[PDB]
């Protein structure tokens, strides 16, 4: 993200987030069994405005 965006300028930003279910790549505590049986998961995201 640009440190500053001057008057009249347009800045481009990139951000990444990891939403964990499993604790880690080797510890599956918290992971979710989602076998394809059709009841849906919901990942709700509210963005800046």
């Amino acid at each position: 993200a640009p440190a500053t965006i001057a008057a009249g300028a347009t800045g481009e930003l990139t951000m990444y987030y990891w939403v964990p279910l499993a604790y880690s790549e080797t510890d599956l505590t918290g992971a979710v069994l989602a076998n394809v049986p059709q009841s849906k998961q919901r990942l709700k995201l509210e963005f800046a405005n």
Partner: protein
Amino acid sequence: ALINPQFPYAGPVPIPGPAPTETMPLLNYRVEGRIAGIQQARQFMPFLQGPHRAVAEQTYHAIGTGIQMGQTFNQPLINTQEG
């Protein structure tokens, strides 16, 4: 006690004593006592009889559901060694 002769201790408190009063009498008490107010069967408390939990255990419900479905990739065929 010591008695000393010839000054001996009088042989009594004698008859010259001054009877000061006849107020000796305790008048017997005669009485009827009645404690009879209507009693109502109940009292209110914050809590009586409870043995409150200091910690509970962890508790849960259960569910499963789904079907048996799969996408698979297999190892290639190989030359058989022996036998």
